[PDB]
Design a protein around this ligand. Structure first.
Ligand SMILES: N[C@@H](Cc1c[nH]c2ccccc12)C(=O)O
Ligand SMILES: N[C@@H](Cc1c[nH]c2ccccc12)C(=O)O
Ligand SMILES: N[C@@H](Cc1c[nH]c2ccccc12)C(=O)O
Ligand SMILES: N[C@@H](Cc1c[nH]c2ccccc12)C(=O)O
Ligand SMILES: N[C@@H](Cc1c[nH]c2ccccc12)C(=O)O
Ligand SMILES: N[C@@H](Cc1c[nH]c2ccccc12)C(=O)O
Ligand SMILES: N[C@@H](Cc1c[nH]c2ccccc12)C(=O)O
Ligand SMILES: N[C@@H](Cc1c[nH]c2ccccc12)C(=O)O
Ligand SMILES: N[C@@H](Cc1c[nH]c2ccccc12)C(=O)O
Ligand SMILES: N[C@@H](Cc1c[nH]c2ccccc12)C(=O)O
Ligand SMILES: N[C@@H](Cc1c[nH]c2ccccc12)C(=O)O
Ligand SMILES: N[C@@H](Cc1c[nH]c2ccccc12)C(=O)O
Ligand SMILES: [Zn+2]
Ligand SMILES: [Zn+2]
Ligand SMILES: [Zn+2]
Ligand SMILES: [Zn+2]
Ligand SMILES: [Zn+2]
Ligand SMILES: [Zn+2]
Lengths: 63, 42, 63, 41, 63, 42, 39, 41, 63, 41, 63, 63, 42, 17, 17, 63, 41, 63, 63, 42, 42, 39, 41, 63, 39, 63, 63, 41, 42, 17
């Protein structure tokens, strides 16, 4: 069970969730204005996170 | 990117059906905008 | 079962829980006034935590 | 005041799917009271 | 199963337990007067612990 | 923030019913306080 | 209840609008919350 | 602009088995629009 | 399963066990007079330990 | 003495849901005696 | 599977075993005279060890 | 399950997903413009990730 | 503490029953001492 | 009765059934 | 039609069914 | 499956095995004369080892 | 003497539930001989 | 499930996948031009990866 | 499954195996003359190893 | 070493059949090249 | 301490029976030594 | 057996009490052990 | 030459059970071609 | 699932795969010309890898 | 195919032995491989 | 499962395998002349290895 | 799942595989001429490897 | 020689339960030959 | 050692049976050498 | 018979069946 930490470093940062399955779409996009944090798990329905705009990211790997 | 699935649909708050007309699901304004555009020009 | 530690560093800090599943909504938001701690697990119904306002955050991934 | 307004509700950060048209998402304290009142009114 | 250590550093420290499930309420609040310790597991019924008032907290992550 | 469910109830020690009046489910003083207030003003 | 309801000082009525009892801030807070969310 | 041609398609690095003759591979944004249009047209 | 070590540093130290389940009561309280040790597991029936009075505590986390 | 009042009972830190109106919570030594007496009385 | 090491540092040291289950009694008390060692597992029937009198204790934690 | 972190260091970076199964095609290609991050899991449908263009990559192995 | 369950009972060595009279189980001297005391004064 | 006597008896009477 | 208009329409027409 | 190492440092050292179950008896005692080693596992039937007389003891927990 | 008394038996450290009224708890060497004798006598 | 990182250090680097099973063939060959990365899992259908041409390789073992 | 290393440091070293089960007997004794090694697993039938006479012993714990 | 199965075939986009002639199974140009050569000389 | 079960028996190589006389179960010399001694004196 | 039983030196009888053979310490050790625990 | 002989076959290191009397054990490249030819000839 | 890394250091290096089962044959031999890498898993059908000719080898055990 | 077959320069026949087309080294390589292993 | 490495340091080194089960016999003895290595697993049928004669031994524990 | 690395240091090195089961025979012997490597797993059918002749051996243990 | 007496048998370190009266324990090479002969004789 | 099971037998390439005569399995030259030797002298 | 001959034969005869 893995998760990503996203801290918005500027306004209007986008976290877009891509769909698990044969076909791939943007199922949900979350918005982060400067200084807001989103902690997001890879899930049954979500197998790719896309981060748009300057932001600080923490993963199971490093920084 | 700037448009998500959420920006197009929404699960009919009733049928988690007359409200969505069996679509299960209601279109947003952005939804129609694109669909009307495509249907008129396809 | 993973969890996040959130300590409010200012008043009115918000912890918003996003729903696990095909569609994603804010199903619960908790309020933290300066110095209040919330320890929150990712759960069957919650797969994304959103933190609004100045706060100290501890995860498995780090601070 | 013992319980506030802030304790109970929260302004929706997006506005709506996020709040389901409610515009206010509730705290745990909020539901506690509401569930208790609804169950016994 | 994970647990949290809470040591009250002042009088009237509150440990409130939030309900596991679709909806979230304060199901129980424990009282800690200065120097009292509560060791609490996250449980079938409890998936969020909230700490009100000055207290020392130990988790799997840190302090 | 200072008021839990435990503070508004209490499981009837008899049925885990005349004691709770089917309620299962003895309300606290705090419980009625809120309830009476809301019912009188709603 | 005291922390919510107070005796209308006039009718121990226009002042209370017939309720027999006014309301504190904490009173409204709860009442507005429940009225907006009930049912 | 908001969404360019590049955002939707993307060409085939190889050309075709890789793209199955389509001549282009779609982005997530691409599918998103296409799935929405096909389901409601 | 996990366990807590409690060594009483003064007379009349209380270890109170809270019940696992929807509702939470003090189901058992053990007494520890200065220098007495209790080693206690979190159990099917017990999901929170409360320590009253000056005592030394060892858990999986620390001290 | 061998077994005082303190060894058997112990008061309720809260007072009541915590002790279920009993006014006191029992030690292990308490149950031990009580279970033995109740089973053989 | 956990166990406690108890070494009696004086005569008449008591290791009392408390019962796993809804109710809690002293099911068995072992006696340790100075220098005698008892190695005891938490078991199906035993979920709390109580140590009376000066003794050296080794646990999964520390000393 | 495992995941790859891809940060685009230039404009027009391509992340192409190859299909799990007897035959292998490019089923989806994502676009990353300088400074955009994609966190991607190996999935039921995806068993090879191909990265085109200057980018920073984090995996279980390293960099 | 100084008294344990062991100090009160003992599993009938026969029925791991005439020996224990269906009690399954024989009382120790300390057992009777307490029980006789309680029954005479209750 | 001794003090120890009452201690036991008071405990039992207060909690029996 | 705007450039953004064609962009969408060309994309849809090339890939539909 | 855990085990204890017992090396007798004097003559007549006793290793007593206590029974796993609701009731606890000495079901077997082994004798160790100076310099004799017994390596003993906690078993289905044995859940407590008691060591009498001067002896060197090695456990998972230590010496 | 090849086998002793100490080898075979052990004085009960408690006295009785611990020895089950036997007063002597036996070593492995003890049972070895006893089981062999009992089985073939 | 294990994976290999392949970074092409020259033009025309080949990653060939060998078939899992009784018989072994080249079922697919991927092309990597200088600076292109392929992250490839060993799969139900693929149990040997062959790398042709100058390339940087990262595995669970080393490089 | 755990094992013990026994190296005989003198002539006539004995490794005796005790029986797993309700009752405990010497089921087998192995003979080790100076410099002979026996590597022995604890088994379905053997749950205690006894070493008689000067010998070097290696276990999961130490020596 | 430079010639895989993917290089000699291609799954028929129609049947995962007239398109592949039952072959399932469109042969590449490279495929026929080898095949024609071997059949002509075997 | 110096006498195991292996030292008092031996599984009959025939039945894992005339060879062991149902005993399954050949007794060693050491075995009879003890047995004869105990039977003669018991 | 020699390490247990010895020939009564008198009847090769009060000395052996009719057993025909006396007993060593090791003899008694085993016999006392078995008699106290048998059946 | 694009594909060699070495690419395709290999001299048996033992000679035979190892090669099953074939004397030449084949590379992956070898089978690739052979399976393709056999399936379509 | 373990694997071996083989890098050919000279031309004509051979990787021979031996069959899992009661009887053992060379079922496949792969050829590696100087600088070519083969990453090979031990599989259902292959339980021994034989390397002929000068080559660099990486295993879980080492080089 | 060019990398295998070439036009017999004589019959665009003893030179090609009636095949109509000779063979390159790469040609034989494949042909010898398939002939030795087919069926 | 576990294994022992035996390198014979002299001629005529014996590795004897004892049988798993209620009764214990020497079921197989292997011969190692100076410099020969035997790597031997504890098996369904073998639960004790005996080494006779000067030899170097590697186990999970040490040397 | 364990394996042995054998590198032949001289010509004619033999790796002999012994059979798993009640009886033990040489089921397969592999030959290694100087510089040839065999990586061999202990398998369903093979539970003892025997190495004849000067060779370098790498095991789960050491060298 | 190729295979000596030592390579096939080997004596019994104890002598007999250990060798089951055979007087010798067999090497792997021993079984190998014996199993082959017994199966085909 | 110098002789293995492989040096004695070989799984009949046909019955993974006339080829092996139900032996499942063909003897090598080394196989016969030993067997002929033993049968002639046993 | 050679020494190697007897070696084999003695081994087989001593262990057969
Ligand atoms: N299920 C995802 C798989 C995926 C995750 N991350 C990826 C990155 C690239 C390609 C595919 C993926 C999809 O529809 O595509
Ligand atoms: N897709 C997840 C839940 C989810 C929805 N939106 C998300 C956004 C981020 C992370 C997770 C989610 C599931 O169904 O299990
Ligand atoms: N989902 C939890 C509540 C919860 C967990 N994490 C959260 C973060 C924010 C808000 C609520 C939560 C429940 O079962 O009720
Ligand atoms: N049933 C749980 C409830 C609980 C867990 N953690 C808590 C913290 C505070 C209040 C209640 C809880 C218990 O008794 O442990
Ligand atoms: N089963 C035990 C639970 C327990 C173990 N340790 C404890 C410490 C305190 C309270 C309860 C416990 C009981 O009857 O109570
Ligand atoms: N089905 C697998 C095939 C594969 C795995 N690794 C490879 C390496 C090269 C070529 C193909 C593969 C995939 O798409 O990932
Ligand atoms: N209670 C344990 C065994 C046991 C009895 N008395 C004990 C004393 C200490 C440790 C364990 C025990 C069981 O039934 O499984
Ligand atoms: N056995 C693998 C191929 C293989 C794995 N390791 C090898 C080493 C050498 C040769 C072939 C292999 C398969 O399934 O096809
Ligand atoms: N219980 C073990 C014997 C045993 C294990 N540990 C012990 C310690 C002391 C005495 C006996 C034992 C058996 O099965 O027979
Ligand atoms: N015996 C293994 C495979 C095998 C055959 N010969 C071997 C030589 C070495 C290692 C493994 C093997 C099995 O059946 O699963
Ligand atoms: N069946 C077991 C018996 C055993 C294990 N360890 C022992 C030590 C000594 C004597 C016998 C044993 C074996 O052959 O291994
Ligand atoms: N199955 C093997 C067991 C074994 C592995 N290594 C050993 C070493 C010595 C004796 C036996 C073994 C056998 O037939 O014997
Ligand atoms: Zn909203
Ligand atoms: Zn009024
Ligand atoms: Zn006793
Ligand atoms: Zn006489
Ligand atoms: Zn061959
Ligand atoms: Zn011609």
């Amino acid at each position: 069970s893995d998760f990503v930490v996203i801290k918005a470093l500027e306004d209007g940062v986008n976290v877009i969730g891509l769909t698990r399955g044969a076909d791939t779409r943007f199922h949900h996009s979350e918005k982060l204005d400067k200084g807001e944090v989103l902690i997001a798990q890879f899930t049954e329905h979500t197998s790719a996170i896309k981060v748009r705009g300057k932001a600080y990211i923490q993963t199971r790997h490093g920084v | 990117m700037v448009i998500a699935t959420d920006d197009l649909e929404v699960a009919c708050p009733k049928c988690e059906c007359p409200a969505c007309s069996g679509k299960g699901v209601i279109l947003t304004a952005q939804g129609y905008t694109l669909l009307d555009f495509i249907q008129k020009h396809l």
